[PDB]
Design a protein around this nucleic acid. Structure first.
Lengths: 98, 91
DNA sequence: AAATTTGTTTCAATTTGGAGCAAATTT
DNA sequence: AAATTTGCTCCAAATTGAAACAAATTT
């Protein structure tokens, strides 16, 4: 049979463990570390824009990558992200990606 | 200048920040490699799910379960926050 | 030459938001 | 006992969708 691949393991990153051994942790964990570190450093400051801050950090590289894959083809890129072709066009504009 | 970064270690044992966006790129590079032209279908929802969870999980930590505060920190309607928490069954 | 994608629209569907309130919970 | 937060509403503002169609482009 096929071994189960849980959703947390579809997107992963190389990490190194306490034994100089390259293993492969979830992307969720990267996001976790990012915010942990954001919070420590935040130190007293009030925040208002944390969702957009994150979402922007993540949409950029996603859009970047999917366009590379679709060799610049917007119809496929939107189709594979499962978003309307209009929305994609809009996100790309947002990020000066054209 | 980059508020959202993660820690990397190089071969010389030196630790060093790296923007989170780089990790997300890596993730996807890899996703696509393994895919051998199998069609991808809801990549956006996929990644969104992978990000909102640890986001929700950590602001709730930080705001000690205070939904009103969390919703303000993130800048989304308090109603929206509930919806999401339900979406991932974090209520 | 044919097929596809792009760059627009216009309008409908869904989601996000803002506010208001009693009931609960924290302070 | 006050103040703040929760769990609702109802609406309205905004974003997302979908479908169309010349005109540009890629096959």
């Amino acid at each position: 049979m096929f071994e189960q691949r849980v959703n947390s393991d579809v997107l992963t990153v190389s990490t190194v463990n306490s034994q100089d051994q390259v293993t492969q942790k979830p992307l969720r964990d990267s996001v976790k570390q990012a915010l942990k570190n954001y919070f420590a450093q935040l130190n007293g400051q009030d925040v208002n824009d944390l969702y957009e801050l994150v979402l922007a950090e993540v949409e950029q590289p996603l859009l970047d990558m999917v366009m590379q894959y679709t060799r610049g083809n917007q119809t496929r890129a939107a189709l594979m992200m499962g978003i309307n072709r209009g929305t994609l066009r809009k996100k790309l504009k947002k990020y000066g990606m054209n």
